[PDB]
């Protein structure tokens, strides 16, 4: 015949619960969330206050520093040591000009001396910071070629005419060669030469040694590959022509697989501040003392008022030092507790009857 199939689905009788939110069931949930979130916020704020960091901005080292050691203005450095809340002890810097380099926009060497009154346990990250450098714009952030990242010897059209991510403005020079790392992302790299150690000023017998290995994810070496170009099909980008003046030849074409600072730079920072790891030390604790960092200024940042700096930290489990997560967990817990108390107050004031068939809108009129 035509009788429909009787089944819990087609008759809409699926097994189910019907959660009515009465006070006796919601107020305990509110209080449970409140207590859990307040506990977690307290633990996060505790374990985050213990994070110590050192930030120094050295963009003004060519014009504000002298040839002898002088204190850094207070607007540049920012020390945070939890055991020492009142530790000013301003750092000092000294500019060692370099008259051979003819790139007078930024040249020389900024020597920075800081003093850490406590340790940094066994895993010390030295990043660099860049402010007001816009690496999130539409044309810039898409100007690279994943045929060259992945190792291929992409021809001119594969590199310049590709859809989406294509090194369009920097695809080929005048001579007819393909800029090897093409696009505005690789061409505009960060150029300062950070040192492979923190010179110990106090006792120069033991310098703190930093490395540039393991500063990027080990899984990035599946995506970045040594190029298969031929030193006659590639030239360096227009801004790598102080690093490779004679061009590319048999032994200088960069291996972008082990070049981990490149793999850090080709990951454009989403926002206006850019903090990229550049030196790590995963072996030794950094004991208290006065250290010295010899940065070799190369990268111009004053033509756009940008700042560049260092940021030495040990870190945390949740990243660096940021009071936000604990603050907002405490705020969430306190808001849930306040709403539970408010519902309890109004429910002991104007508490109505629950299953009252007399409160129905038709039994009242």
């Amino acid at each position: 015949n035509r009788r429909p199939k009787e089944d819990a689905f087609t008759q809409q009788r699926l097994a189910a619960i019907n959660p009515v939110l009465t006070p006796r069931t919601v107020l305990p949930l509110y209080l449970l969330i409140a207590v859990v979130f307040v506990i977690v916020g307290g633990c996060i704020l505790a374990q985050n206050s213990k994070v110590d960091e050192v930030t120094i901005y050295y963009q003004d080292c060519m014009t504000n520093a002298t040839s002898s050691w002088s204190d850094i203005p207070s607007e540049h450095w920012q020390f945070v040591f939890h055991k020492y809340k009142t530790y000013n002890t301003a750092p000092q810097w000294r500019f060692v000009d370099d008259e051979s380099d003819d790139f007078t926009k930024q040249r020389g060497t900024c020597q920075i001396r800081f003093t850490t009154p406590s340790d940094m346990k066994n895993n010390v990250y030295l990043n660099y910071v860049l402010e007001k450098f816009a690496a999130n714009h539409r044309r810039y952030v898409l100007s690279f070629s994943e045929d060259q990242i992945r190792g291929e010897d992409a021809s001119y059209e594969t590199v310049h005419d590709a859809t989406g991510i294509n090194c369009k403005p920097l695809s080929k020079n005048a001579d007819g060669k393909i800029y090897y790392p093409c696009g505005l992302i690789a061409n505009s790299m960060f150029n300062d030469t950070f040192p492979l150690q923190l010179t110990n000023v106090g006792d120069t017998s033991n310098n703190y040694s930093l490395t540039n290995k393991g500063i990027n994810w080990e899984s990035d070496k599946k995506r970045y590959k040594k190029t298969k170009y031929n030193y006659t099909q590639i030239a360096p980008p227009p801004y790598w022509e102080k690093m490779y003046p004679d061009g590319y030849n048999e032994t200088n074409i960069p291996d972008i697989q082990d070049w981990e600072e490149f793999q850090n730079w080709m990951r454009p920072g989403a926002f206006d501040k850019i903090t990229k790891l550049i030196r790590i030390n995963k072996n030794d604790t950094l004991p208290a003392g006065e250290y010295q960092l010899d940065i070799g200024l190369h990268w111009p940042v004053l033509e756009f008022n940008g700042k560049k700096g260092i940021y030495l930290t040990h870190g945390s489990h949740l990243g660096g030092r940021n009071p936000f997560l604990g603050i907002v967990y405490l705020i969430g817990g306190c808001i849930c507790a306040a709403m539970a108390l408010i519902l309890l107050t109004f429910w002991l004031f104007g508490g109505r009857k629950i299953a009252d068939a007399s409160s129905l809108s038709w039994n009242m009129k």
Partner: protein, 957 residues
Amino acid sequence: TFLPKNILFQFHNFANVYFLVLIILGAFQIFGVTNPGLSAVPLVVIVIITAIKDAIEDSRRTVPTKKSRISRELNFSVVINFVLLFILCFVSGIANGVYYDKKGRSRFSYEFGTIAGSAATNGFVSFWVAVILYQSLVPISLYISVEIIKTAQAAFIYGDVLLYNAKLDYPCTPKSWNISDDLGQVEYIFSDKTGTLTQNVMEFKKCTINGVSYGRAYTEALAGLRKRQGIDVETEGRREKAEIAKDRDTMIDELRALSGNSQFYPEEVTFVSKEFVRDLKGASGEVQQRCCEHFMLALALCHSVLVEANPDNPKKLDLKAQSPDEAALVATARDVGFSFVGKTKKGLIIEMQGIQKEFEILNILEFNSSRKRMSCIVKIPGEPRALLICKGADSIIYSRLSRQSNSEAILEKTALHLEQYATEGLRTLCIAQRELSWSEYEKWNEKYDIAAASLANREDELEVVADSIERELILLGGTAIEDRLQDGVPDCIELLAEAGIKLWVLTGDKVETAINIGFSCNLLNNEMELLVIKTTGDDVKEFGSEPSEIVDALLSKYLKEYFNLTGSEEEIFEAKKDHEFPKGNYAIVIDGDALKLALYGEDIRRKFLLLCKNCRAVLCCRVSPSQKAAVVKLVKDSLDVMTLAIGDGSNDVAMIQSADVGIGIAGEEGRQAVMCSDYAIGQFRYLARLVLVHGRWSYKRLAEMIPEFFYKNMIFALALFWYGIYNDFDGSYLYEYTYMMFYNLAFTSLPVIFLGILDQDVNDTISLVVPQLYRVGILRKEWNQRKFLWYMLDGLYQSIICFFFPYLVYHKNMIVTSNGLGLDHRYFVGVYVTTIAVISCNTYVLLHQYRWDWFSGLFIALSCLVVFAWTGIWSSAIASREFFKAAARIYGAPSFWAVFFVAVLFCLLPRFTYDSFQKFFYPTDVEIVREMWQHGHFDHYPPGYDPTDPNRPKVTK
């Protein structure tokens, strides 16, 4: 021609053409920023799905353009969403131009940029790239999701097993699969009577021949009238049925003693008049004997009954008829001794008390629901004569009567007898005959031939020639046939009156019969004033002089007396606003003659409508199909409301098509009202089930699913606008492209679709036990535009939270990893944002579901798991260029999880606290009914409960 027609029918839309322009703007006019090849997968997938559904419809037709109210309000909400998207694009373009104008930036150094003079050009290209960035703020899957929800709700209406009528083998087949949410806003029901509320199975009970009343029967409607009067029913009825059985036995004996009749079968004799056969012999004289003989001869001749064989008895005849009235008349005419057997090539052959003599039926003026009568012309042998036997409604026949050739005593006696029978509750007919001379008949026959042979609407020509020929008649009597209510119409009408629905009954049968059925089916009750609007002379002579003014006076008097209004556009504009079920317990009973006058002029129509907007019950009687349609159109146009029109027949067809939800009943008359209808139930009692359960559910479902859709789109598509602040509204995407497409495809669709398909506030048993929950749909409380705007505001606030919580976890030093390595790419910040957004919108849908079934919960859980699993599956493949290990790098960072949990809390705490404050201190009727259900006041009702079924177990309490 499938594909071109389908693509045209689709790109008649603005979302489809918007996405086509997006594909062309990313490909042919490519600025460079897009993955153009796969940017079409959303559009291609949705157009493929729509083409498949159109193929389904075409196959179903291989096996009327009505739109619900929420569809029109949905178009308005779509327009508001596009206005918001344009405002976003405008702000983006303005701010990007303002920025590109500034004269010291990183781009004059490291981005090989120049000031393109009058940077308004770059601001313009920025607007046009923002239009492509916010491609998710467009409702693109909204229409396919609403069609999926509506088709699934209609499939459940079909596959419901409590809407299946096992006798006719007819499930409630929805003829329109897209207005199922109108059954939850139905406010008026315009119902026929004799096939809708009463089963069209007639038993001939009484008759009046030559002013003499015959027949005796104590029926259920008569018992109801006696109870209404006050006298006890069972005490009298026992004795009355005893006497009826005795009288029937004696009458069968006397019919057997009269003569030998072939088709006389006493096992189904329904006429019970002993005095009829007592007068057939000698009682009231030879004049009365001949009168009764001629009356029964007219009954056995004037009809359209076809004669066939019984498969059981080869001799027995079945008397199949298209009109149950004719069926009953011919059955009684054959029982009394005037058997109608066979139908020769000319006329009919009639057995008159044993002797067969053939008659000649020359013209059959067939019955029409607009003529309200029928007649046939038979030859009387000798110069032979003509006899026009005319049969139909009593008012029509009385209008078409002669003034000189009538006793005017039989006239008033038959009128009083028909009034008595109609008040008792029987369908009254009048039988009249015309003696025609040969010359008059020849004249009229040639007129009839030249009218029938004509093309170009022969109907009106036949009507005019019949109205000319039938103008002179002589009355010989009237009959009465009993019509029993359907099974469970009192219970269904009680449900539909509790639910706040006003039931109008548009009959074509007598005023007194309509009122009797109203009292019997609980449309009207005792202590109810029947504000009758009759324009009848007995009161016309006192009210005024001439009609079309007596009805105006009556409407104005009843208005100014019973309510404090008068017919005026001010009153009409004030009454358009209110939808409450009226109080006052009044009922209008307006005949068709007064309905014509009350519908003529605009001022009197306004008066009549303001009078009938009150008065819970209305009974329009002696109404033609045109007037049925006119009343429905009047109440649906003025005081714009939702109307349902239920019935069967060619007249209810015009009533059904002219209403929002027209329901047709598979009745004894052919299925002509089932075809031109939207649903098709087997009996009236299923209207309560259909309307309350399925329509209320479908209204609640769509009214919750649509704002939820706009909100879930807004969260995701506005986190991109928020990111624009931190790249100067330049047009770099915060999200991966697969994220941008899969969000509305897979990450968020099935929760809202299942909220629309499978959600139930309270189950069917409680929907029918507390039917007053329907009043919210009647009042339009579930779906406003204020509700959609509150949902969009919540989506905007939650988008703020979803973006600026990951942003605030980064902003300090951009180090969020446990091992100091970098996560600062905007695709990884977008993973943060997206995971928060998807889980919050899915948990919003879950918290706003009323019933947590395992199906809905399972697919909510799977939508969340799919976000996580697609990230884990697309990362680990190097085909994701810059996204190569976002899974292992992000899901392994405790900052991700800290942000995840507190941002989901902050997304859901405002709304959940508002819901808690509501459900505590201003609980709606459904929330109070659910708190009663939890404690178990509805624990003794069975699972499949229908209080509109006679053979149901009596409930415990």
